[PDB]
Amino acid sequence: MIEPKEIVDPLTPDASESVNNILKQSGAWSGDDKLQKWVRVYLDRG
Amino acid sequence: LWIVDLNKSDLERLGTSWSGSITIGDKLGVSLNQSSISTLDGSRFIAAVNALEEKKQATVVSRPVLLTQENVPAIFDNNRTFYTKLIGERNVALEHVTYGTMIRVLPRFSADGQIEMSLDIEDGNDKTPQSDTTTSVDALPEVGRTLISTIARVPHGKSLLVGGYTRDANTDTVQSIPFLGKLPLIGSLFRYSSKNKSNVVRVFMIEPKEIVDPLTPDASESVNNILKQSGAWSGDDKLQKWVRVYLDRG
Amino acid sequence: LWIVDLNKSDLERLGTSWSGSITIGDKLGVSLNQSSISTLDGSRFIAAVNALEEKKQATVVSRPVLLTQENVPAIFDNNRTFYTKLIGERNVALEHVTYGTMIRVLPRFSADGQIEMSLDIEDGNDKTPQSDTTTSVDALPEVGRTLISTIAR
Amino acid sequence: VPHGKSLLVGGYTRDANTDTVQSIPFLGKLPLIGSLFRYSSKNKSNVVRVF
Amino acid sequence: LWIVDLNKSDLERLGTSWSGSITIGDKLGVSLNQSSISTLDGSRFIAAVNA
Numbered sequence: 001m002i003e004p005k006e007i008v009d010p011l012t013p014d015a016s017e018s019v020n021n022i023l024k025q026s027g028a029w030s031g032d033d034k035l036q037k038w039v040r041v042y043l044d045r046g
Numbered sequence: 047l048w049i050v051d052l053n054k055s056d057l058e059r060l061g062t063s064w065s066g067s068i069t070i071g072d073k074l075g076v077s078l079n080q081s082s083i084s085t086l087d088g089s090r091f092i093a094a095v096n097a098l099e100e101k102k103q104a105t106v107v108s109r110p111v112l113l114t115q116e117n118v119p120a121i122f123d124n125n126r127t128f129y130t131k132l133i134g135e136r137n138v139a140l141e142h143v144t145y146g147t148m149i150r151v152l153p154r155f156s157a158d159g160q161i162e163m164s165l166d167i168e169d170g171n172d173k174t175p176q177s178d179t180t181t182s183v184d185a186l187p188e189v190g191r192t193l194i195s196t197i198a199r200v201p202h203g204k205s206l207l208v209g210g211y212t213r214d215a216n217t218d219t220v221q222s223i224p225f226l227g228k229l230p231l232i233g234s235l236f237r238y239s240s241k242n243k244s245n246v247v248r249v250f251m252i253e254p255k256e257i258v259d260p261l262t263p264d265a266s267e268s269v270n271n272i273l274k275q276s277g278a279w280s281g282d283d284k285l286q287k288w289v290r291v292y293l294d295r296g
Numbered sequence: 297l298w299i300v301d302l303n304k305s306d307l308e309r310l311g312t313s314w315s316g317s318i319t320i321g322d323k324l325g326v327s328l329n330q331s332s333i334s335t336l337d338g339s340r341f342i343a344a345v346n347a348l349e350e351k352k353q354a355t356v357v358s359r360p361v362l363l364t365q366e367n368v369p370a371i372f373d374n375n376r377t378f379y380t381k382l383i384g385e386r387n388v389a390l391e392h393v394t395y396g397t398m399i400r401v402l403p404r405f406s407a408d409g410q411i412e413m414s415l416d417i418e419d420g421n422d423k424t425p426q427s428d429t430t431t432s433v434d435a436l437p438e439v440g441r442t443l444i445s446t447i448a449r
Numbered sequence: 450v451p452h453g454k455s456l457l458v459g460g461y462t463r464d465a466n467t468d469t470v471q472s473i474p475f476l477g478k479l480p481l482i483g484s485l486f487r488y489s490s491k492n493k494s495n496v497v498r499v500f
Numbered sequence: 501l502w503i504v505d506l507n508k509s510d511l512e513r514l515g516t517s518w519s520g521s522i523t524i525g526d527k528l529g530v531s532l533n534q535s536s537i538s539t540l541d542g543s544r545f546i547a548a549v550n551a
Contacts, residue, residue, distance in 0.1 A: 001298040004411045010204035015251040026105040028466035030495040038268045077344040094531045104467040111460035132388035193373035196364040210361030217354040260454035488515030495508040
């Protein structure tokens, strides 16, 4: 079966906001690390 | 680029299954649920019992980041090469396969401030067959890949869903002996029942943004805090400071 | 694109089947429902009994999603490659087969607001023969595919 | 880049968390004997590479 | 050019897993969580423990 549709708006909530809820729930989150926060602060700027 | 991958599973087996042969007084023999009887003539009845109850869960979130300019093609690549020895005589060669994450993008600003991109995404890994059989030592890395080629246009700071894949499944079997499987307290030794369930989700998301400022704090300042915290710092050495004073001038 | 796959089954065997040989006083022998008697001369009668009653059910729902623009061909691909070692001498090569889900679409808006598409769908998987025989260790992945090529609006 | 400043060119992160639980269906729920039949594993990783 | 690479991990296994064969009076045999019984007919039950 085929079901097409037209996209006019971006994702809500953002792609970087739904991932931070997956990592906190599954327990794989490491944004609170003392050693890795010196470099992950560049990538998670937004 | 975000690559989110989730899994879930369930499994339960409980029951027996009778299959064997017998020999009754070297003049007549009785088989049960078999095809070959002669090579299993000296054996006996087998009551294979199964009991298991399994749960599972797995999340993987991977993210490559790449920086480029307007109208300039860029490549990020993180691969793995597998070399094999084709023992010929004439055109002897080292043949190789390659698999891994790979992005090739060509960004461009529109008139409104949105960013249009021409994407070529590949995300592959190595699928493993059973390790106990002989085909794990030869040149058989079963590779599974995932290719996406499209064109999307996102505003500055927002995001779009480019690809995706879901899969749901549920199987269940029930076996029994026709009359003995309905006994009240003895009939549990003859039935059999299995189940299965899985839920897989993979998505690909794109989030571009515009860079106008350099890093703050500097790249040589965030590294000196990593080396001091992890204990790998050697800028206080008596012997290596005569040469490391040229490189760490700033 | 939705790919729905359902199954159902039923099975019941119940009964015996007699097939064997005998030797009566080293001067006459009696066979029963056989063709070869000489290589089964030292054996006996066999009463193969079968008893089974099986039910089954299986559902699979798979769904690939792809995003593109007007008049732009796009590809989604989720495959699996099987490498084999053809031990030749001259044109030695790694030969490979490939199977998996694959969509190639070319969307286009009509004048009324409907979306016409030019589809090329492939959905394949790996069929498995009996594991106990020797042909499970060589390069025999029996592949079954499903190809569809059409135009819909 | 300006003179003396810096820029982030590449990058890669990866996070993972798996956990399995196996048991025997009835013997795995005994109070003091049922520990000899269960099984449980875990895993976690966090990788960061930058250029 | 700076190339920074960090890692982290965690792992814990605890439990048993029963898989073996038996022979009861040379007329009937019982397997448990196996596929091949004939080449493991002279063996016993195995309780693989992990910690």
